[PDB]
Specification:
Blueprint: E1 12-16, E2 19-23, H1 36-52, H2 57-68, E3 75-76, E4 80-82, E5 85-91, E6 99-104, E7 112-116, H3 117-121, E8 128-134, E9 140-146, E10 153-159, E11 164-165, E12 170-179, E13 185-191, E14 198-205, E15 214-218, E16 225-230, E17 236-242, E18 247-253, E19 262-263, E20 273-278, E21 281-286, E22 294-298, E23 307-310, E24 316-323, E25 327-334, E26 337-344, E27 350-352, E28 360-364, E29 374-381, E30 387-392, E31 398-403, E32 414-422, E33 428-436, E34 447-450, H4 468-471, E35 476-480, H5 490-494, H6 502-517, E36 526-531, H7 533-544, E37 551-555, H8 561-565, H9 586-595, H10 597-600, E38 608-614, H11 623-635, E39 642-647, H12 655-676
Parallel strand pairs: 34-35, 34-36, 36-37, 37-38, 38-39
Antiparallel strand pairs: 1-2, 3-5, 4-5, 5-6, 6-7, 8-9, 9-10, 10-11, 10-12, 12-13, 13-14, 14-15, 16-17, 17-18, 18-19, 20-21, 21-22, 22-23, 24-25, 25-26, 26-27, 28-29, 29-30, 30-31, 32-33, 33-35
The chain binds ligand TCK (2 copies).
Length: about 675
């Protein structure tokens, strides 16, 4: 039917290591966002998408309404106790934002409002609450708020005695701050007034002129993120410096005036470590002896005095730990399962938290107080909605505290499986999939295969209410736990990045091929989705295995990989050399160029595809997907659907901003469901 937009070609040569690549759409990049010929192309593509998808409006409404009708109109957090006050988060119907309340622990009846997001958002274009913490003496409330949606937080202070605000604001912060134990001094992280990278730590006396704030630390390498932490003991505020590879912690005495940063262990390439302090010891999670991490105890900083509590094991990844009165609890991964283990400080007794589900995730929830036997931990599976449990560490009594509520949901209607696929190199790849039992017939069902597979981030199998809209229409939903993710620990990550990145894409194809071969789905109705580094995955897999998929959704996709990674002017590029590599080196240029989706678009048949991007707040800049679609329109040989949807809306932190997310899901699901009919 309709003629799609055709962007002007302006051949722009890029020569590196004597290799000339001609980019015809370089100009779709406009750092200023002025150039009206760029806006015209994004606007023209949006108009083409609106018109191509106009017949799916009814379906988009059915999908939107059934996703909203699953959730409650009310939300009340599980109350927690900190420093002798109980805290709860309250979402009322009609309100755009949460209300934050508290009471003294010995009180039940009355609750005080700490902060009402709705009052805070009045006469502002944007509101997001980045952070909320009462001073140790329970008299002052620090809040980190963003009124501009650029994630530059203002810190302000409220006197709880009379509900009056202090006069100052700390501006361009990360929203990361800590109270000294005097309830009068806060440390906070300033961002670079240009790069907006967190880089300075300041000390602020509450109520005073931010002008008088003392510079405590400045990070020199902008690849080291700067964060603040406070130890369980309350003895130290921690300046946490980390790149993707490498850590360094400085100690601030939280009890005394005029503290200066005390080196813990100075940074050293490929040594990652994080600490706490409790029972007069430092506890250190460190990879110094093994990539899967160990846990050490020390009386002091010096690495030579670190005593092994838990040695690194090749088969068990150590992800994190919480400290309690009588127990260490650790978060681990073994055999493609997340697990929780508890070790008694005195007896050394070991217990495992046991589950009965093939495709679940478990994690340490919020435990702000260490003087208890009660561990709170979270559970979710592809069939069981997200649940908060409280475990008596001594007695093993497990009580449910909260279940995710899902209306119109019958859990026994659904089945899940863990499957292992032998990848082309003999490596075993775990897969989690779920489906509706009564609409299943092998070789018959559409497949939606989801992947990410970068940064060591794991697509852990959990519940999705929205996912029910595909399950109840015959779809088999697949998580492909491909290399580049963290499902099998640090080695799974490292075998999916830099000179191993191709394994990410090979794993996704191998998994899809095996699932079809073994009868999980219809070979003619295989669909895939990924966002961001998941969009890199979508982009590489359709260049390399175009026939495998009927249809693809690629969200805010990283696709112009060589060009972006050659230009430090693009925010994120300086930070990402340890993921993809540095193409200013020919080894990385050649390795990255082989799979860079924009560069490897060729004149061949592609699947149906919906591509999304944003003009404003973005990881991947809008021009990558825009250039990608323009090149695909120019070379692809098929006559299938190719749509670019650019979000022009300015950003929304209210309940309506959650309802926008449901609208996007509905448009994407209606696109795939129309293709599968
Ligand atoms: C999209 C994605 O996963 C990441 C950014 C999100 C980080 C959350 N932990 N980046 S990309 O992979 O999207 C990407 C974007 C820009 C650049 C320069 C490289 C990669
Ligand atoms: C958050 C929001 O979208 C508003 C808030 C309710 C009005 C009270 N001030 N709703 S809206 O319908 O006015 C609206 C405005 C802009 C956009 C982009 C969408 C919806």
């Amino acid at each position: 039917h309709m003629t799609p937009p055709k962007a002007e070609k302006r051949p722009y040569p890029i020569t590196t290591h004597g290799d000339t690549r001609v980019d015809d759409y370089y100009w779709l990049r406009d750092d200023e966002r002025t150039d009206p010929q760029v806006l015209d192309y994004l606007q023209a593509e949006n108009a083409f998408t609106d018109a191509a998808l106009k017949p799916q409006q009814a379906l988009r409404e059915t999908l939107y309404e059934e996703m909203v009708a699953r959730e409650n109109l009310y939300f009340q957090s599980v109350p927690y106790v900190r420093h002798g006050y109980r805290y709860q988060t309250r979402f009322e119907p009609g309100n755009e934002y949460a209300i934050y309340v508290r009471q003294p622990q010995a009180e039940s009846e009355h609750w005080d409002t700490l902060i009402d997001g709705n009052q805070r958002a009045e006469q502002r274009e944007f509101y997001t609450l980045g952070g909320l913490e009462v001073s140790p003496d329970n008299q002052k409330l620090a809040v980190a708020e963003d009124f501009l949606s650029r994630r530059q937080y203002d810190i302000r202070f409220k006197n709880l005695s009379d509900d009056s605000w202090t006069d100052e604001v700390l501006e361009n912060t990360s929203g990361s701050f800590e109270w000294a134990n005097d309830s009068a001094t806060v440390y906070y992280v300033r961002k670079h007034a240009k790069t907006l990278l967190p880089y300075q730590v300041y000390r602020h006396v509450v109520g005073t002129d931010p002008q008088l704030d003392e510079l405590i630390y400045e990070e020199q390498d902008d690849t080291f993120y700067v964060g603040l932490e406070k130890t369980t003991s309350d003895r130290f505020i921690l300046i946490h410096l980390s790149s993707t590879t490498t850590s360094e912690i400085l100690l601030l005495d939280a009890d005394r005036a005029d503290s200066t940063p005390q080196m813990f262990v100075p940074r050293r390439k490929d040594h990652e470590y994080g600490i706490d302090h409790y029972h007069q010891h430092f506890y250190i999670r460190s990879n110094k002896d093994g990539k899967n991490f160990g846990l050490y105890q020390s009386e002091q900083a010096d690495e030579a005095q670190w005593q092994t509590l838990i040695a690194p094991r090749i088969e068990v990844m150590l992800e994190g730990f919480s400290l309690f009165r009588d127990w260490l609890v650790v978060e681990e991964r073994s055999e493609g399962l997340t697990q929780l283990r508890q070790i008694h400080w005195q007896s050394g007794e070991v217990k495992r938290i046991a589950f009965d589900d093939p495709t679940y995730t478990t994690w340490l929830a919020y435990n702000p107080e260490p003087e208890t036997e009660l561990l709170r931990y979270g559970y979710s599976s592809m069939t069981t909605p997200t649940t908060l449990y409280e475990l008596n560490l001594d007695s093993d009594e497990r009580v449910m505290l909260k279940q995710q509520e899902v209306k119109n949901f019958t859990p026994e209607n659904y089945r899940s499986e863990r499957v292992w696929v032998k990848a082309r190199d003999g490596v075993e790849v775990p897969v989690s999939l779920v489906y509706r039992h009564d609409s299943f017939a092998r070789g018959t069902n559409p497949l939606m295969v989801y992947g990410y597979g970068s940064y060591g981030s794991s697509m852990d199998p959990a519940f999705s209410a929205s996912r029910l809209s595909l399950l109840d229409r015959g779809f088999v939903f697949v998580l492909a736990h491909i290399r580049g993710g963290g499902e099998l620990g640090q080695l799974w990550y490292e075998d999916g990045k830099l000179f191993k990145k191709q394994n990410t894409f090979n794993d996704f194809i191998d998994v899809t091929e095996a699932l079809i071969a073994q009868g999980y789905g219809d070979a003619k109705r295989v669909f895939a989705m990924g966002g961001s580094a998941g969009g890199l995955l979508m982009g590489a897999v359709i260049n390399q295995a175009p026939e495998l998929f009927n249809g693809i959704v690629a969200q805010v996709p990283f696709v112009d990989v060589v060009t972006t990674m050659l230009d430090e002017s693009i925010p994120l590029t300086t930070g990402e050399y340890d993921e993809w590599g540095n193409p200013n080196q020919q080894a990385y240029y050649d390795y990255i160029l082989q799979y860079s989706p924009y560069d490897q678009v060729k004149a061949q048949d592609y699947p149906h595809m919906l591509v999304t991007t944003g003009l404003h707040d973005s990881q991947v800049q809008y021009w990558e997907p825009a250039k990608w679609v323009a090149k695909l329109r120019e070379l692809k040989t098929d006559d299938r659907q190719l749509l670019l949807y650019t979000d022009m809306d300015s950003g929304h932190g209210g309940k309506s901003g959650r309802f926008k997310a449901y609208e996007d899901i509905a448009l994407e699901y209606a696109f795939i469901l129309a293709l599968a009919e």
